[PDB]
C-alpha cells in the first residue's frame, strides 16, 4: 500500500487519477476526465489505512473530488470508497456516490451511485 | 411481522404504499405518489423474511416498483431494501435504488440512491 498507491490509475473509461499516499494516511492528487485536456483536472483529497492487515486483505481508502476548477463548476462532488489490492495486477475497486447541490424539492435526485475499478495500466 | 407488515405505510413525503405480506414471504401491493389521484398507483412486489429472529431484530424485506402504469411510463424502476421494526411505532427503514433505462453512454447516471422511512401514521 502507500508506496503501492502512489501513481497514476485509470478506470474503464479513461479517467486518470494521480495520487500521492503519504506516510500518515493522506491521499492527495488530481482527477482528469476523458479527453485529457489541460484542465478537465480537479483536486482530490482522501485518506487510506496506513497500517493495513498483514494477511491478504485490501487497503481501505476513499477520496473526494468537488467538480469545480477554473473552467468548470458542475456544482457537485463525488466520493469514492474502496480498497486497494496490490500485486502483479494491482487495482482499487470502488463504489462512488456523486451528489449535486439541489433545492430541497429536488434533493431526492441529488445522489447517483456507481462503481469504478482503477488499474495502473 | 407478516400480519404486522400488511397495511398502509406512508413516508415523510406522503407516498402511500399498501402491502399484503403473505404466509410464505411474498409482498404484493401498490405504491401511490403524492396528490393521491386515482392512478399515480403502480404495482409492487417484494419478499420479506417470514421466520425472522425472535430476538429484537428487524424483519428484512425489499420490493420493487417499475414506474409504468396506464397513464405514465417513466422508464425506470426502484427497489427498496430494508427492515420492518414493529411495536407501538412500527416502521420500515429503507434505502432505495432508482435506475432509469439509459443508453450505454449514459449508464453512469442511471442509478439514484436514497432512503425512506415509512410509518403507519
Amino acid at each position: 500500500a502507500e508506496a503501492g498507491i502512489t501513481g497514476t490509475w485509470y478506470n474503464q473509461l479513461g479517467s486518470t487519477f494521480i495520487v500521492t499516499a503519504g506516510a500518515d494516511g493522506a491521499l492527495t492528487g488530481t482527477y482528469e476526465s476523458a479527453v485529457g485536456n489541460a484542465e478537465s483536472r480537479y483536486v482530490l483529497t482522501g485518506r487510506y489505512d496506513s497500517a493495513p492487515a498483514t494477511d491478504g486483505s485490501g487497503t481501505a481508502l476513499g477520496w473526494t473530488v468537488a467538480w469545480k476548477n477554473n473552467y468548470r463548476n458542475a456544482h457537485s462532488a463525488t466520493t469514492w470508497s474502496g480498497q486497494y489490492v496490490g500485486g502483479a495486477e494491482a487495482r482499487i475497486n470502488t463504489q462512488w456516490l456523486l451528489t449535486s447541490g439541489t433545492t430541497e424539492a429536488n434533493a431526492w435526485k441529488s445522489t447517483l451511485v456507481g462503481h469504478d475499478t482503477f488499474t495502473k495500466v | 411481522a407478516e400480519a404486522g407488515i400488511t397495511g398502509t405505510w406512508y413516508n415523510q413525503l406522503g407516498s402511500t404504499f399498501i402491502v399484503t405480506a403473505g404466509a410464505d414471504g411474498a409482498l404484493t401491493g401498490t405504491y401511490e405518489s403524492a396528490v393521491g389521484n386515482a392512478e399515480s398507483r403502480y404495482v409492487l412486489t417484494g419478499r420479506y423474511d417470514s421466520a425472522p429472529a425472535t430476538d429484537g431484530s428487524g424483519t428484512a424485506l425489499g420490493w420493487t416498483v417499475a414506474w409504468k402504469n396506464n397513464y405514465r411510463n417513466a422508464h425506470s424502476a426502484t427497489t427498496w431494501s430494508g427492515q420492518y421494526v414493529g411495536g407501538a411505532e412500527a416502521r420500515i427503514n429503507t434505502q432505495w435504488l432508482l435506475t432509469s433505462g439509459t443508453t450505454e453512454a449514459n449508464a453512469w447516471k442511471s442509478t439514484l440512491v436514497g432512503h425512506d422511512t415509512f410509518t403507519k401514521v
Binding site: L13, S33, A34, V65, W67, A74, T78, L98 | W108
Partner: peptide
C-alpha cells in the same frame, strides 16, 4: 455530460 466522465 459531467466532468467525472468528460
Amino acid at each position: 455530460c459531467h466532468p467525472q466522465f468528460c
